Design a protein around this ligand. Structure first.
Ligand SMILES: NC(=O)c1ccc[n+]([C@@H]2O[C@H](COP(=O)([O-])OP(=O)(O)OC[C@H]3O[C@@H](n4cnc5c(N)ncnc54)[C@H](OP(=O)(O)O)[C@@H]3O)[C@@H](O)[C@H]2O)c1
Ligand SMILES: NC(=O)c1ccc[n+]([C@@H]2O[C@H](COP(=O)([O-])OP(=O)(O)OC[C@H]3O[C@@H](n4cnc5c(N)ncnc54)[C@H](OP(=O)(O)O)[C@@H]3O)[C@@H](O)[C@H]2O)c1
Ligand SMILES: NC(=O)c1ccc[n+]([C@@H]2O[C@H](COP(=O)([O-])OP(=O)(O)OC[C@H]3O[C@@H](n4cnc5c(N)ncnc54)[C@H](OP(=O)(O)O)[C@@H]3O)[C@@H](O)[C@H]2O)c1
Ligand SMILES: NC(=O)c1ccc[n+]([C@@H]2O[C@H](COP(=O)([O-])OP(=O)(O)OC[C@H]3O[C@@H](n4cnc5c(N)ncnc54)[C@H](OP(=O)(O)O)[C@@H]3O)[C@@H](O)[C@H]2O)c1
Ligand SMILES: CCN(Cc1cnc2nc(N)nc(N)c2n1)c1ccc(C(=O)N2CCC(C(=O)OC)CC2)cc1
Ligand SMILES: CCN(Cc1cnc2nc(N)nc(N)c2n1)c1ccc(C(=O)N2CCC(C(=O)OC)CC2)cc1
Ligand SMILES: CCN(Cc1cnc2nc(N)nc(N)c2n1)c1ccc(C(=O)N2CCC(C(=O)OC)CC2)cc1
Lengths: 247, 247, 231, 248
């Protein structure tokens, strides 16, 4: 039968493009979402119009809490419930906002570290326990040149590098590859003004523009494919050279 | 007036050696501890015998929880109440145990991520808000070749790298330097069989032995000294070459 | 119509697999060789039997010397002469042997540093000067956990990382991407699967493709996880 | 007996600061130089005035060539000839200039790769062969992974130096020889650089918006050669004021 994939935070933007490209490649998809119900349902409808019974939505908050393990188990279970298998997990969902050193701080910890690291970890556990299997984590090419006042976000993304490597090592004997894709400047925030978007675009050596969502998705497609079957623990930057540019 | 330092997890082993060396260098010290009250008090009494009114203890659990921010604020406050200033923070305390992918898992997250990452972040916040100022984080030289089945621990230590770098950037305008010291094999568990300890020792190129706690402390002393005044965001491996050895 | 690629050290092993996959993808290829003329020509014969006049060979010593810049210019020129264009350069040729700290040492420098770093640099210059363009450098997944007594080899592979990054930055305004593929059994995490030259070639094919159009300065490890395994 | 150190490119700037601080710490020093004879002799004179017979000069070109191994052997031999021992080697000397991808190029290779990588390698060989607190410190570059535009050969050389530092740390560990690096970001700007251009670089540095002094770089070298670094080998300490953490 057709393989199946879970994509977190798949209603919009990069996650949406990943889900679309996996579906185009022949995967059945679980479209996870948190608040964006209308967009998730609209995407599932579009994919099911192309091939019936190949897309479902699954709602969950990925903030850390004592119920997060159950929520993550339920996302994986939702893929088995719909499709009878779960071949690929893409950890894409992510909270992102500044947390200056100088919502409560514990809520910020729960959101930023939960979505970017703890939920990927718990999803990884549940994915492995429930079993070309692979996991792709959406990292950040700027993790070692971080944005000012984004400590908790950056901590979460560093933790995700650690998970990628640790899980690659530990899950290799189960035939599960674990890799990352690290955007630099990709889709800018909807709320960001044009001037500020252009400041970011002008930093990029290759073309002075952000990555499209489809360009990020292309790297995910490579990593889950048969053409990457000896690749595990690798993080592919898709950053147009941004990370190589000094201050 | 003598400077003052907070050392977390200072009752035993590496933290104890760091507290002793800072004291020998002329610092007054807050000896933070969790369970090791007798050893913390013994150390304080030894240091106060050497010079009166130069050491106090401060008990706190550094597991993540709703109350962790207040606990971390209180640790920094204890230094100001005892000594009128807080010049140095050493984030040494750390939980360390395996968490296989295949205590509840959320307790393990709270302990491993809390001690290794969130508490350092909150302590950093409190240290900075309350202001040769510097912070030293105890990292891990093997963070990119992790031990099998230690994913949460490894995630925590990766997050600590991210904190070290983010905080170095953000706190530089306030004159606060933020660095790390990354042991490889240092003090092994007393209960570990010598035959297992020897397997670790023989991996180390430089002398086929573990680092003493004092050798780790020496790097901390350098980083807080005037001889490191331009150094921020650096993580110094103290590993005898271990991290350079392939499988 | 068809794009063209230069692959150094293409007669055998990884370079051969790369040349074959590029050719199967629709590239015309220059098969560079130093000593392996028979094997280079045998490969060209195989590829030309599939599509006439789509593979040529080019001899060059990639050891550093006074004549290396001209030799590297000729490799690139051979692609333009045969095919009228040069879209892809794969810096695959490599020398590999120990050089203990405790052939003359300067011959070892010329071979190890010259083949592994200087020739890639000179080829990069000549490729860029003559202009979906890209360069792929064959790196080492274990560059920061080096083999004992391989100092000069390791130094050259480090230099190649620096070239990859420097050239990605400098050549971005010309639309030339520059990336790397870093190859690495009971110790290999993915050791259930045998390592193959084809797996390395698959990563090269990805990097030269339109599916990697935003990727530059990236080095993809294809090592079964080996670089993650501690001592 | 006082230990002895070789510092390459020690007539001026960071190399002189390292030689001075090693001498202040009690080392006898070989001040290697290439073209800066007056400055090298002036320094040796100052150091010998402080303590007689504790400094000598040694001239050598560190460009790669078929004689470079003999030259490097001779630099180490000069330390033994003067002082009867050689405890520390500091690889500081460095050619630095752009080599755009779009002097002959082979001369540029010989100079940039010779000074920054091959000479350190040969000096490391000779130091180990001629043999307690023995160590080597290589002067690296904190910006090695965010390189300056049009500096590919220089950057290749500095990358190679990282590889040497790591390879030599592993291989020489059994002999009790530690091998480490110090990686400046912005330290002393070129003498010929205009003030406005210097300020462009200074303004990038998070910690103080200023370059590292030569002494600040030397402080890290002194730590690495000291007993306080006895378990440290294969480490490269950035001394960069946070520069390498700053995004585009
Ligand atoms: N865009 C870039 O330039 C860029 C740069 C570097 C790295 N990345 C990484 O690439 C990935 C995709 O980036 P993006 O910009 O497309 O992401 P995004 O739009 O900021 O976030 C993706 C989705 O994450 C979900 N999410 C946020 N908080 C959540 C929570 N508490 N629980 C569950 N889901 C939650 C949201 O789902 P709902 O909308 O359904 O609520 C959101 O649509 C992220 O991991 C990001 O860190 C992106
Ligand atoms: N030893 C090594 O070989 C090695 C290797 C790599 C890195 N490191 C790092 O170097 C540092 C020191 O290592 P070590 O071996 O000396 O550490 P350790 O003995 O394992 O732990 C140090 C102290 O951490 C405190 N701690 C643990 N859980 C805590 C909690 N929930 N709340 C508050 N404090 C807690 C404990 O204090 P109480 O005893 O008072 O309860 C303990 O004594 C650590 O950061 C470690 O990760 C060490
Ligand atoms: N094999 C591995 O496991 C591995 C691991 C890490 C990295 N790599 C890298 O992957 C690439 C290919 O590996 P490989 O094992 O296939 O390489 P290889 O067979 O060791 O060498 C490939 C070719 O390089 C050419 N070559 C060697 N010295 C030369 C010189 N002085 N001038 C010109 N050409 C010269 C030879 O061509 P002729 O035969 O025509 O003379 C040789 O066939 C290399 O860059 C290597 O460093 C491989
Ligand atoms: N300054 C910075 O901001 C900075 C930044 C990053 C890294 N670093 C590194 O730190 C070290 C010291 O920097 P610096 O600015 O003080 O260096 P520098 O002044 O540029 O050069 C130091 C010395 O190198 C010697 N040298 C150059 N070419 C030579 C050759 N062919 N043979 C022998 N010696 C040669 C010169 O000796 P003579 O004068 O006797 O001819 C020169 O005085 C260098 O390794 C450098 O790459 C410095
Ligand atoms: C170049 C990278 N990028 C694009 C971007 C856009 N969306 C993103 N989403 C997630 N989850 N993760 C990311 N890394 C991400 N990145 C960026 C980089 C920086 C910014 C920025 O300055 N701010 C500041 C104010 C915003 C806010 O919510 O304040 C409450 C947070 C965003 C915005 C976007
Ligand atoms: C070589 C590094 N090292 C020494 C060590 C010893 N203590 C440590 N403490 C902290 N907080 N962090 C560390 N990295 C650390 N490391 C090691 C390395 C590995 C081990 C090990 O096999 N186990 C398995 C069983 C142990 C247990 O019973 O719980 C305490 C958990 C640790 C023990 C010590
Ligand atoms: C911020 C680091 N820095 C200071 C500096 C100053 N001197 C240095 N010397 C050596 N050997 N190595 C270094 N890395 C070094 N760095 C820099 C960084 C960049 C530059 C620069 O734009 N140029 C361009 C013009 C110069 C020239 O054409 O000489 C012929 C080459 C150097 C100058 C100095």
């Amino acid at each position: 039968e057709a393989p199946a994939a879970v994509v977190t935070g798949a209603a919009k933007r990069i996650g949406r493009a990943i889900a679309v490209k996996l579906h185009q490649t022949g995967y059945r998809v679980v479209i996870h979402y948190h608040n964006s119900a209308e967009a998730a349902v609209s995407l599932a409808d579009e994919l099911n119009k192309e091939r019936s019974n190949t897309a479902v939505v699954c709602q969950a908050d990925l903030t850390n809490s004592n119920v997060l393990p159950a929520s993550c188990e339920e996302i994986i279970n939702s893929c088995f419930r719909a499709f009878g298998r779960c071949d690929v997990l893409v950890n894409n969902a992510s909270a992102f906002y500044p947390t200056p050193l100088v919502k409560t701080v514990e809520t910020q910890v729960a959101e930023l570290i939960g979505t970017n690291a703890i939920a990927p970890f718990l999803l990884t556990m549940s994915f492995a326990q429930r079993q070309n299997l692979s996991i792709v984590n959406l990292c950040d090419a700027m993790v070692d040149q971080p944005c000012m006042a984004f400590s908790l976000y950056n901590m979460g993304k560093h933790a995700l590098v650690g998970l990628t490597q640790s899980a690659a090592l530990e899950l290799a004997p189960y035939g599960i590859r674990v890799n990352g894709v690290a955007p630099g400047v990709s889709l800018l925030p909807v709320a960001m003004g044009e001037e500020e978007k252009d400041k970011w675009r002008r930093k990029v050596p290759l073309g002075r523009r952000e990555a499209s969502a489809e360009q990020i998705a292309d790297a995910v497609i490579f990593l889950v494919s048969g053409s990457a079957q000896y690749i595990t623990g690798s993080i592919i930057k898709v950053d147009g050279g941004l990370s190589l540019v000094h201050a």
